[PDB]
Every structure is written in structure tokens, then in C-alpha cells.
Amino acid sequence: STGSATTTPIDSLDDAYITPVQIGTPAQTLNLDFDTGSSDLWVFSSETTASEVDGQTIYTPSKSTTAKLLSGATWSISYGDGSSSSGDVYTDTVSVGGLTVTGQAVESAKKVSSSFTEDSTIDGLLGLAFSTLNTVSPTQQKTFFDNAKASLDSPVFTADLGYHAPGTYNFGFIDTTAYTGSITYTAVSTKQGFWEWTSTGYAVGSGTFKSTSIDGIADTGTTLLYLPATVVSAYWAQVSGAKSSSSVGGYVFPCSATLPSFTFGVGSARIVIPGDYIDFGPISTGSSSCFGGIQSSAGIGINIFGDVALKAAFVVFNGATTPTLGFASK
């Protein structure tokens, strides 16, 4: 089997992407944030505290003839950005782009943090990291991809995120028309439960490529590119007027600037992030100070190849017995 679903930016900045997901019988379609940095499929629901729902579409398990409470199971997750959610668990039929999994754990939110409530466009998350990170207790549950893997034509999914445009998540096949050149594959460590890999270096604009190992994670659920302070300083030094602002929370630059590109290495291959992808616009409405899309990871503990980086590539998440990542230009 295979599946193919379009993923759409939630706003004009590409802050996140939503993909329609069919849950239950008859189908209830929710728009989920596919997140290769986490491993829970959780949804706003009829169980979510009413004051914490503000425009989201909810899953109502009592209206699904295939929903079954997973007795005793609870979940609770906290994300790198400080947001969180928690609740109980059903199993139900879940379909993405024509690919159906029966008995998928659907984690129903009883509580969500304010950042989720305030974002009416995201109805939940669909985690695509390794199932070892799933938070369901006392019996950890499998991700949608893990459940689908054996049925797929090939045990892979691909992320093709658009710049200010829709893109595609495919399951079970590699669309050879969706990228240019070849796909360069690189080794993955699953020791932390992430799609963790080592970039071979970087360049700023037309500058020389610096060969240096940068360990990080491929994370579709993170907006920006978070890299070591040395690398980030070298990037922003090429933008006149750029400065790290403790009060704003990162690097900011004059909105009148033209940003240089940023290249990262994948083995001997190179992925070029155009400068425009690094512009996240005014820090507040009407400001001439703009927020940068490359930021320091120094306070995170891990480097994160988020959407800024991934949207410049066609990315293969190869879930074979020994997983690997692939990157192609597009």
C-alpha cells in the first residue's frame, strides 16, 4: 500500500504545516501537524476542556463506530517549545492520503496548553519519530508509520514541504518526479528516539564550505533551523545590522536586508536554503525589525533541522531495519 497527502502552511510565514487525517467511522477529518520530532498522535476532542478549545475541529469518539477506549491508558507530553497536552486514549481507524491503519492509538486531549488553544488551525499532532518516544502509559503505543510499515510497498515516508506553498507527505514510495538530481542517504542514530543524523558542514551565501560535523535531528514539527552558536554567528555576521536580542529571543535584522543563502552538507552533497526562506518577518506588526529563521541551539541541547532546512529539500525517512535519511534538491 501507499498514501499521499497534501500538507499546507498554516499561515503566510510557514510557521507549521497541516495535513488532513481521517479518523473513525464515519470519517472525522482533522488537520494535524505531522511531527518527525515526536511520537504521539493526539487530537483535540469532545473531551478537551471547553475553555481550551477555540476554533479547532474536534474528534468525538462516541460518534465513531470503530473507536474503542484503550482502558487505563493515559498520555502527557511536553514539547521543546514549552507547550504541552495530556489525556486518555482510544484506538480507531486512521487514514492518511488513502493509507489506512486499523487499531491506531488516537490520544484524546483532556488538557492542552495555551499555545495550542490559540492556534485554531492545528487540530492535533501526528508524530513520526520513533515509537520509543511515545508517551502513552502504562503500555507505550506505536506511531502511525510504525503501524503502517509492514503494509507499505517500501518502509519509507517522504516530506516535501513547500515554501509559501503546499507540499506533500508520501508513505510507502519515493516519487522520483518530486526532486532533482539524486538522493543522498546518510546514517541515522535512533538512540534518542529521533531522526538524528550528522551534517557534514555548512556555507554562508557564496562563501567557502566549512567541513565540520553537525549532529542534529530532522524535525518537521519545528519551524526554524537551530544550529551551534558559532555557525549562527557566522551566518548573521553577513547581514548588516543583524544582532542577537535577548529581549526578543534570538537573532533579529533590519527588514530592509537581503538575506544570504545557507548551505548544509549531506555527505558530499549540498542543500541550499535560499535567503528568503530565512526571513520570518516583523517581530511585531509594523516593526522594521525582522526575526531570523536560523537561531542558536545553545539553549536547546540539540541541533534541529526544522522546516526552514527541510523545505529546501525532498527528504526521505527510511524506516528499514537500519533507518537512514535521504536528502535531494528540488
Ligand SMILES: O=C(O)CCc1nccs1
Ligand atoms: O534596533 C536597531 O538598532 C536598529 C533596527 C534593527 N532591527 C533589527 C536589527 S537592527
